[PDB]
Structures are given as structure tokens and as C-alpha cells.
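Response to reviewer comment R2.3. The reviewers asked that we include at least one raw input/output pair. We reproduce the pair for Bet v 1 related allergen here without editing.
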Amino acid sequence: GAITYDMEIPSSISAEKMFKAFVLDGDTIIPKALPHAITGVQTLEGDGGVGTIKLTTFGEGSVHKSVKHRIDGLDKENFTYSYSIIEGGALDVFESISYHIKIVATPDGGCICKNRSIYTPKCDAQVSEEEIKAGKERASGIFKKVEAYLLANPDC
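Raw output as returned:
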């Protein structure tokens, strides 16, 4: 089938600005969030919206130098965001890789932000604990460097 793993994050930035900083503005913030194994991020479409394609590229300790993914869906009623890997070396081991954020407000001027990944094998791979734990540290780094970017620069 397809296997999946999740994490939940308390945040104070607005749910739109959170995902905007997380991948749309991710051109600097994702490199700064994972400065060892990531080296760069770039857009490959009319940006920001659904059906935007995005490059992400990698450094030391890395199985593949690059991957491409899409901004796949967004639902600002309960701010769910889909984003999915479409080509590049992550799909050498896997048939498809995908991701799911969910964001809802609090009574305290913030948000609760859940994040998740989905891995579809070529009917063989088990999914490695390495990307479960690195996925936590990488997504955490983004949710921290995004709030620190918007601490310095909320006017964007």
C-alpha cells in the first residue's frame, strides 16, 4: 500500500503565513533549516498556488543530489496542505512520496500545526527510520526558521 508517519507542532504565526514560509518562500528558509544535507530550493511554475512545481537539492550525507515536488492542494477552512514528490532520486527507491500538513487556530492567538509524510514503495522498500527521524528534525527546523524569519520580517 503506502506507509505514513506524523508529528504535531505548537506555533503562533498565522496558518497561511506558516505554509507560505514552509515551502512557497522556502527558497532560503529550507536551506537554512537543514544546512548539512540540504543545499538549495527553487520554483518551477507560476508560484505559490496549487500545481506549483518546486526543486529541492542536497549536499553531504545524501542518497541523491536532487528531487522535484509539487504544491498539490490547500484548504484554509482547516488549513490542510498537500505536497508531493513527482521525480528525482527519492523515487529511485519509491513509487511516490507525499506530505500532509494540517493547521487550525487556537483561542490564544496561535495555531496547532500537524505535519506528516507518505511513502509508496516499488512494492519492496520498508521505509527507513532515518527519514522518519530526519523528517522530524528537517520539518522542525523549517517550522522554527519560518517563525524566526517572520519574527525578524513579518512585513515580508
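The CA atoms of residues 9 and 140 lie 8 Å apart. The first strand starts at residue 3 and ends at 11. Further pairs are available on request from the corresponding author.
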